[PDB]
Structure formats: C-alpha cells, structure tokens
Amino acid sequence: SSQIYRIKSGVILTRPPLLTRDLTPFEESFYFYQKRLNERLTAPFRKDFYFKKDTAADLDWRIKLKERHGVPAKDIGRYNPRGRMAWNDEVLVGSQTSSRKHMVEKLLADAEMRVSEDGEEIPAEDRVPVEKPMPRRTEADEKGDVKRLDRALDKTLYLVVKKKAKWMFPTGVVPTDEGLHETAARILAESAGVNMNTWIVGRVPVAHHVVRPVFLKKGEKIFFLKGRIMAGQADLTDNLHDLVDFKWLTQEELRSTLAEEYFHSVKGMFAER
Amino acid sequence: DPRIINILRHFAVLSPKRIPPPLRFGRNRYLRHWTIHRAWLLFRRQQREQRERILMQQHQSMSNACEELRNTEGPGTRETGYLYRVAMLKNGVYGLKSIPIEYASRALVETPGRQAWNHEWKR
Amino acid sequence: ATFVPRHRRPYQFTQLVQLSDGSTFT
Amino acid sequence: IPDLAELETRSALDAPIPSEEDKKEFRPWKRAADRKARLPSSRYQYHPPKYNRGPLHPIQSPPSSDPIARDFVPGPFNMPRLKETFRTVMASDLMTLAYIHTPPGTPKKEPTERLRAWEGDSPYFANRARRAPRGAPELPIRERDISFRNIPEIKEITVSTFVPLGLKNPDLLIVARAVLLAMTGTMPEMTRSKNNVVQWQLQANKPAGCKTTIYGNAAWEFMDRLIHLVLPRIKDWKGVPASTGDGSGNVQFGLNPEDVQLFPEVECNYDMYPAKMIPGCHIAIKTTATSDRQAKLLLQSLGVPFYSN
RNA sequence: AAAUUAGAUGUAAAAAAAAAAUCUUAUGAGGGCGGAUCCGCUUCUAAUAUUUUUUUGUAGUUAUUAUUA
RNA sequence: ACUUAAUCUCAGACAAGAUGUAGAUUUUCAUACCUAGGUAUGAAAUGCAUUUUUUUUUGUAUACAUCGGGGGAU
Ligand SMILES: NC(=O)c1ccc[n+]([C@@H]2O[C@H](COP(=O)([O-])OP(=O)(O)OC[C@H]3O[C@@H](n4cnc5c(N)ncnc54)[C@H](O)[C@@H]3O)[C@@H](O)[C@H]2O)c1
Ligand SMILES: [K+]
C-alpha cells in the first residue's frame, strides 16, 4: 500500500532586474520629439523664480545658458520655440542629440560649478568635472562569472544547483509535519545557506513538474515556489543534500542547463526580462 | 510685496492670454506626426500584448500546479487536497509585514550604484 | 457652446537624480 | 493570391530606407534661406473652434490627440522608473501572492440585486419601491479578486491645500498656489469654503485653498519623489496610518508645512517665498484597487511603510 | 462636536440562424364576402411584444494542456 | 412599504486550517542508521475538546455584522 507519488517541494529563487531596460531606438526618438513640442506649448522659464539677481547661482546660470544659446533645457539641443524658424523642430535621421548618451553628457557638464565664490568664471583648465555614473555592465559581465549576482543587472537570475550529476532548483521531500511553504524555506537553508536575504513570495506554487511512475518506481510531484533574493550569496558548505556546485543563470541560459522536460515545466513561470 | 510680485508674475505668464497658441502644421508635417502617433500607439499595443501574455502564462502555471495539488494525496496519511487547502490560505498576505520593505523599496535605476550587489551580507 | 479649455503647464526640465547609493536615474 | 491583390499596390511602408546621399543634401535650413521669399499659404485653413457647438454643427472640433487641437498635451517624455518596476517585478508577485484557484468547470457566480425587492403573498409587495441599500447609506463597491486581468495600479493623485487664514492675508493663497505648482508641475485650481463658523472666523463662499490632480506618468513620478526623497527625510516618521482608506482603494494622508518644503522643487527656491507661508498638503492617492487591503497591499509593493494606528 | 479635499451600483460591447404557436397592429397584398380608400365579419404576408418556448450555432484570435505527424 | 409616536429581539453562522490533550502502538511517510528488510525515532491518520469575522485565521455566504462612555478582574 505504498504511495505512488513522492511529493517534493522546491524553490525558484530569483534576483529581479536591478536596472531599467534599454530604450528602443524609437522610444528615444519619440521622447525627444515630444520634448520639443513641450517647448512650444509650455510657459517660458522664469529664472527670477529660482535664482535671485547677482548671485553665485544666477551668474553660473547665465554663463551656461549662453553656451546653450538661450535654451534653458539641456537635453533638447538648440531649438527656439518662437521665431521664423520655429517650424524646424524635427531632427534628421542618424542624429546623436536624441540618444541617451548625449543626454547624460550634457546634464553632467551643466552640474559643474562654473562660477567661483567671488563671481568670476573659473578657468577652463581649473574646472573640476563631476563624478560620472557607473557603467551598466559590471566586471562580472565582462568576465562572465555565473556565480555572481551583480551580473546581467537588466535580467532576472535564477538559482540553479547541481546534485551528485543534474542541474535543478533546491528541492526536497515534504514531510508530514511541514507544508509546501515552510518546507521550501528549510530546504533553501539546508542547501544554499542562511546568509541570503530571501523572501518566499507566499504559499501558492508557481510551477510543478510530475515524473510518472514506472510500473514499481515511485513517481515525484515537484511543486515550486517563487523566491526573491535581496542580498547575500549562496553557500554550499556543510549542506545536507549532496550538492556540489551552484550558479545564477538567466532565462535563456536555463534552457541550456536544465533538461527539456524539466525546463518546459518551469518556463511558464518566467518573466519578460 | 516684492517677493509676492515675483510669484504673481509666474502666474501672469500661465494665463490663457500668455501661453503659446495651438500648433499649426502643414500637410507633410501633419502626416509626419500622424505616423509617429500611429506607430507609438501600435508600439504600446505590442507592449500591452506581450505584458498581458506573460501574466496569463504565469497565471496558467499556477492553475495547473494547484489543480494537480488539489488531486494529490499525501504526504503520508493526509487526505486529498490537504496541501492545496493549506496553500490557498492568506495568512498575513494582507497585513503590514506582508511584503518586505527591502525588496519593494529597491526600484529599477538607469545605472547601478557604487556597489551593485552586496555579497558579504550575513544573517 | 461648450468652451474648449487649454492646458496651462509651466516649463519642465530633465533631471539626473543620484541617490545616496550612487545610482542614477532621470 | 487574390486577397493580396486587394491591398494597395503602392505602399509607403514597404519603401526602402532613405539614402545617405539624400540625407546629406536634405537641409531644411538652406531651403528657407535660398528661397529668399515666403512660400504661398495652403488653401486648407481649418482651425479648431474655440467652442463646441454640437455634434451637427458644420464646424466640428478634432480630438485632443490631434496636434493642432486646443487641448493637446505633448506625449510621454520618459518612462517612470516606478511604473517599469511595478510592471517588471511586482506585477507577478501580487498576482502570485494573492491567488485563489478556481476549479476548471466552476459555474459563474450570479450577482444578486443590491436594491432588494419585496417578494411574498402580500398584495402590497407587488408595487412597493425597491428597498434601501442594506447597511451603509450608499452601496459600497464590491471587491474584485487580484487576477492576471486586474492588477491594482496607481491612477491619479490629488494634492489639496486648505488655508483659512488666507481670507485675512491674501498672500497666503498666492504662496500656497505656487508651492503646489512647482510640487506637481500643473496649475492648481482655487477652492472655496462651504460652511460658516464664527469661532474659526470661517466665511462661506470665499477662496480658501487650492488643488491639483496629476494623472498618468506624472503620478508615478510624484510617488517616487515622495517615497524615496521626501518621506525618508521627515524627522521621526513612523509611516502611513494603517487606518487610511475610504473603502474603494484610495489612500489619503497629509504632510506638514515643514515636510512640504523638503520636496526638492520647494527647497531649491525656498528663499523666494515669504516666511511662514508654505502650507501643508492633503495627498490622496487614487488606485485601480477596489478595497482597503488591496491598496495597502499595492503601496507596500512600491515601498510605503505602514504603522498600526 | 463643528473648516477642506478625495471617494462611495452593476452589466454589456465578433456574429447569430431557424420552426411553430398565443395575441396585438398595418395608408400591406388597393385581398375575399356582405353591405381601393366607409363598415362588422374575414384568410395570407410583414412588423412589435410575449414562452423557460423545439432547437441549431456560440466561432475566430492569443495562450495553456492532451493526443496526433 | 415611505413618513410619525412608542416598544421588542438580534448584532452573529458554516467549511477549512491551526492549537493542544490523554490514548491504541496498526498502517503510511520523513530522518538517524544498520544491513532492499527490519531496527528505532518522530509526524500523520483517529475520537472528544479547542481557537474563527477583522485577531498572531484565511475562505465562503452576508448589513466586514457595531462604536464610545461607565462599573470590575488581570
Ligand atoms: N490603452 C488601450 O488602448 C488599451 C487597449 C486594450 C486594453 N486596454 C486595457 O487597459 C489597460 C491599460 O492600458 P495600456 O496597457 O495600453 O496602458 P499604458 O501602460 O500603455 O499607458 C499608460 C500611460 O503611460 C504612457 N506610456 C505607455 N507606454 C509608455 C512607455 N513605454 N514609456 C513612457 N510612457 C508610456 C501612456 O501614454 C499612458 O499615458 C491594459 O492593461 C488593458 O487591460 C487598454
Ligand atoms: K503599452
């Protein structure tokens, strides 16, 4: 009267994307196209409402405003909303002004203090630039270290583990005392360690994998829960399960590591990025 | 009074009499905008269909798993659907500590910080 | 005869926000 | 194929990309200069009317989407990082967190009439007026389940100010209207008092406040500024009260006058306002939710702390 | 206790086709019969309404699952 | 019924889950083991209590079905 299926409970631990997706070539051109229509329909900018006359801020604003040719905005190039040539608001194909690289470059060049405390323009050589933002692709991205969490910051990374070999998610049999939600926590701690700031979403499983029995050999009904990591790293030392290695993989890399049937069952849980 | 006059000037510029007038396009300029508008609204459709496709696919994965769970018996001497009836509970889901504020506070950013990820975090 | 009002919006800029973490968004 | 024969023979969409040599020779600025004259105006000179005089009037008004329209507003300028965040990570967590499995052939639930009718053998019940809403005086909206077709999201935000003392010092209303302007990027509409209280020196039907409503992307940007740059700076801040909620998915709370000037748009030019004139605001966050617990579950996904009180 | 603002119902929106019957109408067939459009009886067709009625059909599209090549 | 005067009753029900208790020591299941079976270990199954409408208890069905003041015990 032995049970036919062996109920297991896994955990699909994921690191959400930490960066916004790259804007398509059309999304960039569209924003810029609408920023110049706003120039023609918004009220003018009154510097007297933010800067008071004859101050370190006013003088600094006037100098850089002349380099922009009067345009108070820094990310729309040179466009006069009023005048004979107002119609020429559209930009020709193959332009650099609409890109996001040129936008950040201009906004940073406008943050450096150009007027000393005494009101005199700082020499062109004595002007200290501003600290630029960090690059989107970190060192791990260039090296390709799959055991790192700061890799592919614009994609979701899934925790996959090897067992003495087949790659899979942290799994384990469900005892009679614990449910799926409180069994997935004990297994993750006994497999990847306790130095990960993880959050098991809830009690509902997001995917399942069923291995039919062999009329016999007991079948397995694996139920996966969604896990979200916020800090830390997986630690496979002193693990109770026969785990050897681990690696954080993307959605496109999972299908190259996991089996075809094992992947076809968890693919539905995947997200856009 | 001087400062209030500045504030009033800010409004005097926003009056309907001062704000710029409605745009005036030709044909080729209007048709150029008609396509940019026709392609943007279609782009949103492609993003709306994709976004709603993933939500439906992720949802169907839950239905399938829970449907299987409903008809399971175990583990051991536990009636059918026990794990199912225990998984459909909403204990603390609608409370104050439901979602950890460390995960919800971290939003997407154009560029990462000086330390993208903290691997040295200890319990 | 329903009057068609117009939107009265002030001038707006694009700003780079650098959090304490060093991360930047616009 | 005959079906493909019915499509337009000459398609602009199926034309090749513009030539680089043509791009080099296309100079809109040289045409106006080389012309040395003004091109004749086109005979099409339709301009949107200033008034809507009916659906059958000879001259009709175009939709707001028309760029030449009077109510046209330039489209999006960027993607609010909190909308991409919610739609990228938190859309599925709320759907997975709050999920009830319906069996495959579950019969569709039939809604019962909320304005009951009298049914019985008494001849009076026939033509009796429908009963009143049971419980509350007004029917509350019924909660919808968080589905993959119904994800609670932020819809609009209303920032309102009430300055009673402005009836004596008219400048308190000018400053309040400007602070609410830079804070939200729109022109607030002045409000008036509706009651008469002599103890408080309140007179009815006199301008005593201002209110703005930000919709779409503007409302997602404002939330980020509030959550990540304003609220974390309020001294000894505990969190939004857990009692907030009108029973329909809208969250309301208020800021102090010293916390309104923490807004980056107000601290930059804080010296341009007269002293002790920056007011406190009433922020009302309207969501697509249909419950108090759904809204509090939605805001927690965006990083709002809630405290018990 | 008493100031302002925000809220406070639900459903539907691809498309139907067809048979008979219960009435009611018609400046419909210039219907037929008595005394073209006047009148009380009158069949047929059409339209509105009513049956829980006899049903037939309920696709296509996107996705999931199962079989099949 | 709506409105008017006065009076009376109710303000909660079920399913699941959880929490314990004496058991019988049979079956299933998980681990420490031994050598695929037994050996144990616990857990469940089981009977009666027990918690439950905003609670550190969710769901269904319902008008979320109730709030302060005052007198007591912790
Ligand atoms: N909008 C429609 O025409 C439409 C069509 C079918 C269904 N629906 C239903 O309505 C819901 C919402 O409609 P939606 O998904 O089309 O809204 P949306 O997210 O595409 O638009 C939201 C707002 O942000 C702007 N926006 C959209 N994409 C942007 C981007 N990439 N960058 C910057 N700004 C952007 C839009 O102009 C709009 O003002 C849908 O989920 C669906 O349920 C809507
Ligand atoms: K879209």
Side-chain angles (χ1 to χ4, degrees):
Chain A
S1 179
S2 305
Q3 284 206 341
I4 316 184
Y5 288 100
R6 188 191 312 282
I7 294 168
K8 289 171 166 289
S9 176
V11 62
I12 301 163
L13 199 69
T14 68
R15 187 227 61 185
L18 300 180
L19 302 175
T20 61
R21 62 166 182 80
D22 297 317
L23 297 173
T24 59
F26 176 52
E27 265 178 321
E28 275 178 342
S29 304
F30 182 87
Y31 300 158
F32 185 86
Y33 181 86
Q34 300 293 318
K35 286 198 208 95
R36 280 199 172 183
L37 294 184
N38 212 49
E39 194 72 3
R40 306 174 66 170
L41 296 160
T42 49
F45 175 66
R46 297 184 64 265
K47 78 189 180 185
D48 306 76
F49 189 66
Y50 295 99
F51 319 98
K52 59 206 308 188
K53 217 204 180 191
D54 294 330
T55 48
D58 183 76
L59 301 174
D60 192 15
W61 169 264
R62 278 154 48 187
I63 293 169
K64 295 182 289 198
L65 184 76
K66 278 200 71 160
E67 289 163 3
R68 288 184 260 114
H69 290 273
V71 187
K74 302 89 162 186
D75 62 334
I76 57 167
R78 180 186 177 178
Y79 172 64
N80 194 19
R82 304 172 39 185
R84 51 150 174 246
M85 217 70 181
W87 57 269
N88 221 8
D89 54 2
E90 296 201 71
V91 162
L92 302 204
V93 75
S95 178
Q96 192 217 31
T97 314
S98 71
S99 60
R100 192 229 159 187
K101 169 169 170 54
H102 177 275
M103 181 202 250
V104 175
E105 182 274 346
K106 283 290 189 282
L107 291 167
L108 294 165
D110 195 87
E112 65 186 10
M113 177 57 70
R114 207 135 182 179
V115 167
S116 61
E117 56 78 28
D118 53 81
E120 261 192 355
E121 181 166 0
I122 304 177
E125 73 200 283
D126 199 5
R127 268 197 283 92
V128 63
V130 181
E131 187 191 8
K132 287 171 182 123
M134 290 279 289
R136 304 252 298 183
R137 298 179 63 267
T138 57
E139 184 174 14
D141 260 311
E142 193 72 83
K143 285 176 126 295
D145 192 7
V146 295
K147 292 209 181 197
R148 274 259 150 174
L149 270 155
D150 66 342
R151 185 181 71 92
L153 295 167
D154 71 322
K155 314 184 192 177
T156 315
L157 297 181
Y158 297 73
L159 175 60
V160 177
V161 173
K162 177 185 261 181
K163 168 166 281 184
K164 182 215 168 188
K166 274 230 172 186
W167 295 95
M168 65 186 184
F169 299 107
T171 52
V173 189
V174 180
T176 310
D177 192 18
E178 304 172 349
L180 291 171
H181 69 283
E182 42 180 335
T183 293
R186 195 197 80 261
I187 291 161
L188 186 64
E190 292 174 4
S191 49
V194 293
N195 287 333
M196 304 187 297
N197 202 18
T198 61
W199 169 57
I200 309 301
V201 169
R203 301 157 172 260
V204 187
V206 300
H208 82 299
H209 180 53
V210 181
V211 189
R212 298 289 173 186
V214 181
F215 291 89
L216 71 165
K217 184 173 182 54
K218 299 186 59 180
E220 304 186 337
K221 284 180 172 175
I222 311 176
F223 297 101
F224 301 107
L225 268 75
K226 213 182 193 192
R228 281 279 149 91
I229 190 171
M230 298 108 75
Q233 177 62 296
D235 191 60
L236 258 63
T237 65
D238 294 18
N239 52 221
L240 278 64
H241 310 75
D242 298 333
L243 317 173
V244 177
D245 290 353
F246 77 93
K247 48 168 67 174
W248 295 83
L249 294 172
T250 57
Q251 298 192 160
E252 308 188 15
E253 297 174 345
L254 247 68
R255 85 186 307 160
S256 305
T257 306
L258 307 179
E260 67 191 271
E261 272 186 349
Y262 194 89
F263 172 83
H264 186 90
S265 63
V266 301
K267 80 180 203 172
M269 166 270 195
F270 288 2
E272 277 165 295
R273 316 221 306 278
Chain B
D1 197 5
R3 281 173 307 185
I4 277 129
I5 298 171
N6 193 9
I7 314 325
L8 284 187
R9 281 195 166 97
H10 217 66
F11 304 160
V13 165
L14 283 166
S15 67
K17 307 131 67 181
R18 240 78 66 173
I19 56 171
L23 305 172
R24 279 172 134 91
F25 293 165
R27 186 160 202 191
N28 283 22
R29 182 69 182 83
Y30 174 87
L31 288 176
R32 270 184 276 149
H33 181 102
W34 182 82
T35 68
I36 295 162
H37 179 82
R38 268 271 163 181
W40 174 252
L41 255 56
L42 188 71
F43 170 78
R44 284 175 52 195
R45 168 176 293 271
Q46 298 170 357
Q47 296 290 298
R48 188 194 327 121
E49 288 182 347
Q50 188 206 5
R51 149 164 35 88
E52 290 180 346
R53 201 199 327 281
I54 275 76
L55 287 171
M56 185 172 58
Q57 288 178 334
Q58 288 176 343
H59 160 85
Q60 285 170 324
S61 194
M62 279 190 297
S63 302
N64 295 346
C66 299
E67 185 73 5
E68 257 292 13
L69 197 58
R70 197 166 58 93
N71 303 139
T72 58
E73 50 182 2
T77 53
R78 305 207 90 117
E79 55 176 346
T80 55
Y82 167 79
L83 297 173
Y84 164 79
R85 293 194 306 277
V86 172
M88 292 296 139
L89 297 175
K90 260 56 185 161
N91 296 16
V93 164
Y94 297 95
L96 305 170
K97 311 178 195 311
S98 55
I99 302 171
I101 192 160
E102 313 226 350
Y103 164 60
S105 65
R106 184 153 191 170
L108 313 187
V109 185
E110 303 276 73
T111 58
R114 305 184 213 85
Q115 192 194 15
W117 191 263
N118 177 18
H119 299 83
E120 289 79 57
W121 187 90
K122 258 61 179 175
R123 198 68 164 81
Chain C
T2 316
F3 179 66
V4 182
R6 299 179 41 69
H7 295 259
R8 301 151 57 194
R9 301 170 299 105
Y11 197 77
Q12 282 211 327
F13 301 82
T14 300
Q15 192 181 41
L16 256 165
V17 188
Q18 182 184 125
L19 296 169
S20 60
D21 202 349
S23 60
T24 88
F25 51 99
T26 202
Chain D
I1 310 178
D3 291 314
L4 302 177
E6 280 160 277
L7 296 197
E8 151 68 80
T9 305
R10 312 157 286 269
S11 25
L13 303 187
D14 297 352
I17 273 320
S19 176
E20 261 306 321
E21 167 187 4
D22 298 32
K23 194 274 211 170
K24 175 148 196 167
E25 282 292 46
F26 200 88
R27 305 165 96 179
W29 65 264
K30 194 162 182 290
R31 258 136 51 198
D34 287 8
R35 187 170 298 110
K36 216 149 291 312
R38 288 179 305 288
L39 220 46
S41 58
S42 188
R43 61 170 188 260
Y44 175 96
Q45 297 297 347
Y46 163 83
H47 304 299
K50 188 137 53 46
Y51 292 92
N52 278 325
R53 300 181 183 283
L56 295 166
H57 191 71
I59 293 152
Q60 227 68 44
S61 302
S64 287
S65 60
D66 210 309
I68 54 139
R70 307 185 71 76
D71 41 350
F72 171 83
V73 200
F77 317 102
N78 69 335
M79 175 59 118
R81 65 142 187 170
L82 248 56
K83 201 182 66 152
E84 214 189 272
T85 303
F86 187 77
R87 286 180 163 182
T88 298
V89 311
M90 269 298 177
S92 53
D93 288 338
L94 290 174
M95 188 186 70
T96 306
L97 186 75
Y99 170 80
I100 57 107
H101 175 66
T102 55
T106 311
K108 282 286 188 174
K109 59 234 287 182
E110 187 180 6
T112 58
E113 201 81 6
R114 307 191 70 174
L115 301 179
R116 300 163 290 169
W118 299 82
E119 292 119 331
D121 281 47
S122 187
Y124 302 81
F125 292 1
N127 296 341
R128 264 183 192 185
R130 282 178 291 175
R131 306 195 66 171
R134 206 180 184 184
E138 297 276 309
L139 291 167
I141 64 177
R142 271 149 174 172
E143 180 186 79
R144 290 164 160 273
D145 307 328
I146 288 167
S147 64
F148 75 106
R149 296 292 303 190
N150 165 39
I151 295 289
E153 273 181 27
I154 285 169
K155 187 184 167 181
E156 36 172 325
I157 296 164
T158 298
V159 189
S160 78
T161 313
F162 183 54
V163 193
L165 292 169
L167 306 178
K168 284 172 165 177
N169 190 12
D171 311 279
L172 283 165
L173 293 170
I174 295 160
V175 178
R177 199 182 194 187
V179 177
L180 250 62
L181 193 160
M183 185 194 309
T184 66
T186 185
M187 192 64 176
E189 302 185 6
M190 303 299 292
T191 71
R192 308 189 190 182
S193 60
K194 311 209 180 307
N195 285 322
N196 214 285
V197 189
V198 306
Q199 284 190 346
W200 296 330
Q201 301 160 18
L202 185 69
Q203 290 131 32
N205 204 252
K206 289 173 70 175
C210 37
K211 70 167 161 190
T212 81
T213 323
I214 51 202
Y215 317 84
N217 292 359
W220 283 98
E221 294 204 338
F222 182 94
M223 281 300 296
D224 173 314
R225 275 262 204 258
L226 202 63
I227 295 165
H228 309 283
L229 295 178
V230 176
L231 297 174
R233 298 186 185 181
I234 295 166
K235 297 177 182 177
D236 278 316
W237 195 65
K238 302 161 190 60
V240 180
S243 58
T244 190
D246 50 356
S248 305
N250 305 334
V251 175
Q252 296 97 4
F253 60 98
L255 289 175
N256 271 316
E258 53 169 50
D259 312 340
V260 161
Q261 69 187 73
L262 293 170
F263 264 92
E265 289 85 49
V266 185
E267 76 189 348
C268 62
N269 69 337
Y270 166 81
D271 291 0
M272 311 307 295
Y273 309 108
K276 291 175 174 174
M277 288 208 180
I278 291 160
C281 59
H282 282 292
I283 298 162
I285 303 159
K286 284 152 278 164
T287 81
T288 315
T290 57
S291 175
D292 286 330
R293 62 177 196 172
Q294 287 193 355
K296 280 185 284 229
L297 187 69
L298 166 60
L299 300 200
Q300 281 165 7
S301 285
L302 305 169
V304 178
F306 287 86
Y307 83 129
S308 189
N309 175 244

